[PDB]
């Protein structure tokens, strides 16, 4: 029956284009993530509401609310009633895994006559004292592709610092590079471990010289 | 059982998959459902309003995972001023000629009629070819009042513009009583906007109406 | 001789099936949609930071128009809100004041007792709604909070009070004559009928003795 | 529009590849062929049970015709067998009498020493073939067999003798004047040049003191 | 290019018939097994040569030849120099795994006026004392589909016995079935665990009443 | 690169498999190689000869994994007498009209010429339609002798039969000297058979020749 079978093909060829176009949609779908977006708003709002704990303290589960000193933030011993201060997701070492690279635009408004340029924070190394887990000590490389007299230049420096789970803060100070570089400071308050809000500051006053919103670079 | 049953098996199977296919194409469309997008984006806005201003007084935020402030005078001007492009990719005029919006009062401390409703008809709308950031409008503000001593109807006409800069249409005072309308759009909605009636000079709010696009 | 064209057609299909499974698979490895009960909580948390015109003793209609009507008028049988939002079921849900209802959280005291964060439990013991005065659902409950986390002693004061549909707030005080303990205020402005922002107060001045964010069960 | 007929053709093929792999697979899960060196040993073992006409001092040609020629005539340079099998290399292989050659097995004594089964090792120490008398490959070897399985003492007698191409038999005896030990007879009628049926004898009467089936190395 | 591509098919269709016919060959090939046949001859011949060990003894590896009493045949302790008396393949319990069924024709020439009929030995159970492994004790069911006065009858009986690795002998005696049945005796001398040579005999003299060559029935 | 390079890739791959296919078809044929079968089966026979007789004096063994003895008078008779069928599936006559066999002497204690060779030509062969178990033959036994006093040639003719029962052709005595030939076939070979020259009456062997089919 050459017709019903040779035509049942023009039917299949369709599914071929369909299945293909369908691939494109699954690609569009991965970009619009809900459970992620919602998290951005949660964090975005919690930032306004503000943890009900004093500076340097960790707020626990929205049900059994209670304050914990970040010296226990994530130390290995159940300190909160809900143990939220040891919940894996709070202490994902991956946020600042050695090799992670964060880029973004650094808009200056405080201590330098710089044109909106880009900064590239990249974690060099990361130790975690087995007898004091509450902190991830780390070294990193800060580069700044900015334009000066003439063409494209690169003002970079090596940094040392730490990551605090409690506040998801990453502090990077210059490795005594006597060239006077502004310590960078990032907070990963955005609902994920991919994006962070940073500022260049004076190690002393912590005065904010510039705003820098970084994003973790894709490895593909 | 041969050229009959082996041909209707390579067919009832072609469909048995054509289903599993469109079945997914559905689950996908469900996460791209534009109606869900705006609805959520709309929520985002409400929040953006609570957060400290992202950019200076007279600047437009381009959003994204890497923010950039550009002058409001650049939004929808024809030039790509923002790295991401926001300042140029969303330039659709909501209140365009022919459209009608019905406002439901909810706080009226100034209108002369303290009316229950208030229709907003858009007569004409034209954009200057060289200045895309602002679209000029001509609108008739209709009103159905009714007291004991009488029963009036009104259709005051007024000029106004819509700034893609901040999705805010300003309708110049119709009557010489220094009262004008200022409705700022959601950003993602466009079928509902809060309409504040203010004293042009002062910019005092004294009447809020929720306007819905009469569809 | 005959299956020469079919033996492969079934293959072209056995193919699609795989190119699709390798899709439906890459699908599941993607975050699912969020329970509407979550979005609801956001719209709530958010709506709570936004500015609100209703003056003390007034709450806004649940409609699309944020009109303000007096608390004494919600759920009284007469459409008081422009749209009637003050009378639709989603507003007058008794879900909260149901007998046996219990809300708990971790009470962290800031003003009336040594006690270090302990568990607080305000649970409803009985509640009637006078036929002619629906605005209020008069009720009785119990407030219990752990004393010694070790030997598990626990205080249990009996309470009296009502539930305000308008403010969506549970207001309980001690029965009068039983060691004069505490009272408690719980706001269910959290979006649904199971989460609330409770605060143990001192009946007399409604002054906050301690605060605990509660959940239901 | 164009690949609509190709996208599947490559599939009909990607198909065959599998229907075949699932075959080549079911193949390997099948016993491989047997090394020719095995069949050889069978044809041997068997051929040894079959009746043979050659009378003592005679061995049969390796040809297709089982003709019998005197032992003193194999490998002497003159075609003595009907077909010349007594002179082809596969017969006159020195492979066995190669210097350093060593054959061992487990000697189980049945007539001349307490000793419980122990390891026997007859190894060739030197061997020349007189230019004018090829029939025999005169040689010298050593016979060693363990004494005390515990402290590992071991007897090592030196031997003299030759190798008979005909009978394919190694015949060694003690050198005369060294504790008068034993001799040894090894038949390599086992099919190849590495397996033999050795028996430790008493030089004098060739009487079997013990027997051990040997292998080479 | 409709021709070179539409014809490159008449080329593929060929491989389809080929690959198929090839399946048939792989089926024929499984029937003619060499490594198996050779083994049949080895055993067949070794049977003529005869183990160089006295009755009730186990012959070890053709290299380090030596005799072992079958009370050690396969007891768990290395008794032969080559340990061939513990070599797994010698003590494959599977030869007489419970559930194995052996059938074959029983030609009678000694103690019964029976017409060439079939016997069906099927292993019922099989214990193996953990403190004495040298023997597999077992129960089995012997059936004999033979024709008598009229039609097809079945003369069966329950049996108890043992399997000896050393000689690969399986002895099955009647479970005191006072109906006087001839004990069956099988030897798995054939190079495999599938076929065995049996005889019906008197438990006393072990005199051979009949020849019976069994084969393990396929489970498909 | 499109309708050119994507068409020569769905071709150079069709062959890349057509190879792997016939590659296996070879490895298979290698294990079914009939020449290997007979060669091995032939070996089996040699063994069957050493083992105690499988069946009585005048009976034919059907072999297989389940043996059965039937009368030799039944082998190749037309009736299926053996369960397995052996008695009827291998009934091909080796020495058929036209065929020639060359024998190489190797033990001669009786022939009048004690010849080096001995050709065996088969003139005619006919099988009785009702008795298939025996095929009757007419053969010429040729011989090339050569002494000092003379040089003779001989071509003695003799009758004979071939019994499928045991692959043994008996050639009745040619000369009135009571000497006949008896060659028994391998069972699987048929291109080589040992030919024993015997005294018909006694059945005494006194001459062995290996006969090869002259091809
Ligand atoms: Ca802790
Ligand atoms: Ca622009
Ligand atoms: Ca009401
Ligand atoms: Ca305290
Ligand atoms: Ca010679
Ligand atoms: Ca001894
Ligand atoms: Ca043992
Ligand atoms: Ca027959
Ligand atoms: Zn820098
Ligand atoms: Zn029986």
Coordinates of N, CA, C and O in Angstrom, one line a residue, chain B residues 17-89:
Chain B
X17 N 3.6 8.8 19.4 CA 4.8 9.6 19.7 C 4.5 11.1 19.4 O 4.8 11.9 20.2
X18 N 3.7 11.3 18.3 CA 3.3 12.6 17.9 C 2.6 13.3 19.1 O 2.4 14.5 19.2
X19 N 2.1 12.4 20.0 CA 1.4 12.9 21.2 C 2.5 13.3 22.3 O 2.5 14.4 22.8
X20 N 3.3 12.3 22.6 CA 4.4 12.6 23.6 C 5.2 13.8 23.2 O 5.7 14.5 24.1
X21 N 5.2 14.1 21.9 CA 5.9 15.3 21.5 C 5.2 16.5 21.8 O 5.6 17.3 22.6
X22 N 4.0 16.7 21.2 CA 3.2 17.9 21.5 C 2.9 18.0 23.0 O 2.6 19.1 23.5
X23 N 3.0 16.9 23.7 CA 2.7 16.9 25.2 C 3.8 17.7 25.9 O 3.5 18.5 26.7
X24 N 5.0 17.6 25.4 CA 6.1 18.4 26.0 C 6.1 19.8 25.5 O 6.2 20.7 26.3
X25 N 5.9 20.0 24.2 CA 5.8 21.3 23.6 C 4.8 22.1 24.4 O 4.8 23.3 24.4
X26 N 3.9 21.4 25.1 CA 2.9 22.1 26.0 C 3.6 22.6 27.2 O 3.7 23.7 27.6
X27 N 4.2 21.6 27.9 CA 4.9 21.9 29.2 C 5.9 23.0 29.1 O 6.2 23.7 30.0
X28 N 6.5 23.1 27.9 CA 7.5 24.1 27.6 C 6.7 25.4 27.5 O 7.0 26.4 28.2
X29 N 5.8 25.5 26.6 CA 5.0 26.7 26.4 C 4.4 27.2 27.7 O 4.2 28.4 27.9
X30 N 4.2 26.3 28.7 CA 3.7 26.7 30.0 C 4.7 27.5 30.8 O 4.3 28.3 31.7
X31 N 6.0 27.3 30.5 CA 7.0 28.1 31.2 C 7.4 29.3 30.5 O 8.2 30.1 31.0
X32 N 6.9 29.5 29.2 CA 7.3 30.6 28.4 C 6.0 31.5 28.3 O 6.0 32.6 27.7
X33 N 4.9 31.0 28.9 CA 3.6 31.7 28.8 C 3.9 33.1 29.1 O 4.1 33.5 30.3
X34 N 3.9 34.0 28.1 CA 4.1 35.4 28.2 C 3.3 36.0 29.3 O 3.7 36.9 30.1
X35 N 2.0 35.6 29.5 CA 1.1 36.1 30.5 C 1.7 35.9 31.9 O 1.5 36.7 32.8
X36 N 2.5 34.8 32.0 CA 3.2 34.6 33.3 C 4.3 35.6 33.4 O 4.6 36.1 34.5
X37 N 5.1 35.8 32.4 CA 6.2 36.7 32.4 C 5.8 38.0 32.9 O 6.3 38.4 34.0
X38 N 5.1 38.8 32.1 CA 4.6 40.1 32.6 C 4.1 40.1 34.0 O 4.6 40.8 34.8
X39 N 3.2 39.2 34.3 CA 2.6 39.1 35.6 C 3.7 39.0 36.7 O 3.6 39.6 37.8
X40 N 4.8 38.3 36.4 CA 5.9 38.2 37.4 C 6.7 39.4 37.3 O 7.1 40.0 38.3
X41 N 7.1 39.8 36.1 CA 7.9 41.0 35.9 C 7.2 42.2 36.6 O 7.8 43.0 37.3
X42 N 5.9 42.2 36.5 CA 5.1 43.3 37.1 C 5.4 43.3 38.6 O 5.6 44.3 39.2
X43 N 5.4 42.1 39.2 CA 5.7 42.0 40.6 C 7.1 42.5 40.9 O 7.3 43.3 41.9
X44 N 8.1 42.2 40.1 CA 9.4 42.7 40.2 C 9.3 44.2 40.4 O 9.9 44.7 41.3
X45 N 8.6 44.9 39.5 CA 8.5 46.3 39.6 C 8.2 46.8 40.9 O 8.9 47.5 41.5
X46 N 7.0 46.3 41.4 CA 6.6 46.7 42.8 C 7.7 46.8 43.8 O 7.8 47.7 44.6
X47 N 8.6 45.8 43.6 CA 9.8 45.7 44.5 C 10.8 46.8 44.2 O 11.3 47.5 45.0
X48 N 11.1 47.0 42.9 CA 12.0 48.0 42.4 C 11.7 49.3 43.0 O 12.5 50.2 43.2
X49 N 10.4 49.5 43.2 CA 9.9 50.8 43.8 C 10.2 51.0 45.2 O 10.3 52.1 45.7
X50 N 10.3 49.8 46.0 CA 10.6 49.9 47.4 C 12.1 50.1 47.6 O 12.5 50.7 48.6
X51 N 12.9 49.5 46.7 CA 14.4 49.6 46.9 C 14.8 51.0 46.6 O 14.2 51.8 46.0
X52 N 16.0 51.4 47.2 CA 16.5 52.7 47.0 C 16.6 52.9 45.5 O 16.8 52.0 44.8
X53 N 16.5 54.2 45.1 CA 16.6 54.4 43.6 C 17.9 53.8 43.0 O 19.0 54.0 43.6
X54 N 17.7 53.1 41.9 CA 18.9 52.4 41.3 C 19.8 53.4 40.5 O 21.0 53.2 40.4
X55 N 19.2 54.5 40.0 CA 19.9 55.5 39.3 C 19.5 56.9 39.8 O 18.5 57.1 40.5
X56 N 20.2 57.9 39.4 CA 19.9 59.3 39.8 C 18.5 59.7 39.4 O 17.8 59.0 38.8
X57 N 18.1 60.9 39.9 CA 16.8 61.5 39.7 C 16.4 61.4 38.2 O 15.3 60.9 37.9
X58 N 17.2 62.0 37.3 CA 16.8 62.0 35.9 C 17.5 61.0 35.0 O 17.9 61.4 33.9
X59 N 17.7 59.8 35.5 CA 18.3 58.7 34.7 C 17.5 57.4 34.6 O 16.6 57.2 35.5
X60 N 17.7 56.7 33.5 CA 17.0 55.4 33.3 C 17.8 54.2 33.5 O 18.9 54.1 33.1
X61 N 17.3 53.3 34.3 CA 18.0 52.1 34.7 C 17.8 51.0 33.6 O 16.6 50.8 33.2
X62 N 18.9 50.4 33.1 CA 18.7 49.4 32.1 C 18.6 48.0 32.6 O 18.4 47.1 31.8
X63 N 18.7 47.8 33.9 CA 18.5 46.5 34.5 C 19.4 45.4 34.0 O 20.4 45.7 33.3
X64 N 19.1 44.2 34.2 CA 19.9 43.1 33.8 C 20.8 42.7 34.9 O 20.8 43.2 36.0
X65 N 21.7 41.7 34.6 CA 22.7 41.3 35.6 C 23.9 42.2 35.7 O 24.8 42.0 36.5
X66 N 23.8 43.3 34.9 CA 24.9 44.3 34.9 C 24.2 45.6 34.6 O 24.1 46.0 33.4
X67 N 23.9 46.4 35.6 CA 23.2 47.7 35.5 C 24.0 48.9 34.9 O 25.2 49.0 35.1
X68 N 23.3 49.8 34.3 CA 23.8 51.0 33.7 C 22.8 52.1 33.6 O 21.7 51.9 33.1
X69 N 23.2 53.2 34.1 CA 22.3 54.4 34.2 C 22.6 55.3 33.0 O 23.7 55.8 32.7
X70 N 21.5 55.6 32.2 CA 21.6 56.5 31.1 C 20.5 57.6 31.2 O 19.6 57.3 32.0
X71 N 20.7 58.7 30.6 CA 19.7 59.8 30.7 C 18.3 59.4 30.1 O 18.2 58.8 29.1
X72 N 17.3 59.8 30.9 CA 15.9 59.5 30.5 C 15.6 60.0 29.1 O 14.7 59.6 28.3
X73 N 16.4 61.0 28.7 CA 16.2 61.7 27.4 C 16.8 60.7 26.3 O 16.7 61.1 25.1
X74 N 17.3 59.6 26.7 CA 17.8 58.7 25.7 C 16.9 57.4 25.5 O 17.0 56.8 24.5
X75 N 16.0 57.2 26.4 CA 15.1 56.0 26.3 C 14.3 56.2 25.0 O 13.7 57.2 24.8
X76 N 14.3 55.2 24.2 CA 13.6 55.2 22.9 C 13.8 56.5 22.1 O 12.9 57.2 21.9
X77 N 15.1 56.7 21.7 CA 15.4 57.9 20.9 C 15.9 57.5 19.6 O 16.0 58.3 18.7
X78 N 16.3 56.2 19.4 CA 16.8 55.7 18.1 C 18.2 55.3 18.2 O 18.7 54.6 17.4
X79 N 18.9 55.8 19.2 CA 20.4 55.4 19.4 C 20.5 54.3 20.5 O 19.8 54.4 21.5
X80 N 21.4 53.4 20.3 CA 21.6 52.3 21.3 C 22.5 52.9 22.4 O 23.7 52.7 22.3
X81 N 21.9 53.4 23.4 CA 22.7 54.0 24.5 C 23.1 53.1 25.6 O 24.1 53.3 26.3
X82 N 22.3 52.1 25.9 CA 22.6 51.1 26.9 C 23.3 49.8 26.4 O 22.9 49.4 25.3
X83 N 24.3 49.3 27.1 CA 25.0 48.1 26.7 C 24.0 47.1 26.3 O 24.0 46.6 25.2
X84 N 23.1 46.7 27.3 CA 22.1 45.7 27.0 C 21.0 46.1 26.0 O 20.5 45.3 25.3
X85 N 20.7 47.4 25.9 CA 19.8 47.8 24.9 C 18.4 48.2 25.4 O 17.6 48.7 24.6
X86 N 18.1 47.9 26.7 CA 16.7 48.2 27.2 C 16.2 49.6 26.7 O 15.1 49.7 26.2
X87 N 17.1 50.6 26.8 CA 16.7 51.9 26.3 C 16.2 52.0 24.9 O 15.9 53.1 24.4
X88 N 16.0 50.8 24.3 CA 15.5 50.8 22.9 C 14.7 49.6 22.5 O 14.2 49.6 21.4
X89 N 14.7 48.6 23.3 CA 13.9 47.4 22.9 C 12.5 47.3 23.3 O 11.7 46.5 22.8

